[PDB]
Nucleic acid binder design. Structure first.
Lengths: 71, 69, 69, 72
DNA sequence: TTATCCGCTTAAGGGGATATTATAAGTTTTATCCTTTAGTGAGGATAA
DNA sequence: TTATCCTCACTAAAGGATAAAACTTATAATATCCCCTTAAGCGGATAA
């Protein structure tokens, strides 16, 4: 499937936006599906540096994926 | 490592590892030049922590975060 | 009943009790399972007697011992 | 908050004193030194009082600065 | 579809450093072990 | 009735020390705290 190492929010957001794109999902439907505003999703994607982890583990849900750490 | 689904557990994993390596909050708060009271609030109240500090902390422990299903 | 401060004063004391109550050392002994002789030493020579026995014959004269300041 | 019931066993009496000893902040060693006996003896008293001798009992009762009486 | 935008309530991060704790030591306070002698205390029992 | 002896298995207590456990400091380490400046995210929602 697809795993690479992410080391930064500007690197990590890239991949997530790619996932949503690929499954052809629109921001408007992830937001009205997890309970956050469309804006939230857009600000996240273009402004990853300062977003709350609740949002980040909340979007993974939307994208139907999870995460693990590794050395 | 197992799978992480919420900020809280995400902080336990990184905590659990910080202890295993016998590292202290102070010796790792200077390796990334960050506030000692930040690594603290992080482990206890990670829910609203910035993703920048998160990654500065992650690389502090010499590991790397990864997406999956 | 005044305060006692020696194994002797403590013995004369309890004996005077056994005496006034028509009891004998040979009978007091039966009821609490101790050698009649043992009671004879308790009164005549209490210094090396044993607290157990001490509270065996005590509870035998159906009495108790409370501390005092 | 300050009063004593009636002691019926050799343990009850033993622990009753171990309590007065501590409530006064006295170590088994200074009491022992006072009355010329070993601390090793004060020790076995609060622990294994069944076989202890009255001599010792009144020796500690005294140093602890107490006395006793008989009850009905 | 999505990057943008005023108002408005709630909070992390960089500063600077301290209440607050969980650990190492550091010793007190107790409990135990050795050897010997001596006296219970239980069996059984008998003077006076 | 009660004080005493005789044999025996058992241990207090005292002399001489010391393991093992309870409380006290050291002292590093994790959580808190005040103040500023700053961005988040929800609301209703609109330009591109």
């Amino acid at each position: 499937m697809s795993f690479q190492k992410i080391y930064s929010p500007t690197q990590l957001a890239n991949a997530m936006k790619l996932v949503r794109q690929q499954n052809g999902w629109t921001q408007s439907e992830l937001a009205k599906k997890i309970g956050i505003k469309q804006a939230t999703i857009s600000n996240f994607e273009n402004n990853p540096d300062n977003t709350t982890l609740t949002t980040f583990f909340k979007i993974l849900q939307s994208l139907e994926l999870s995460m693990t750490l590794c050395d």
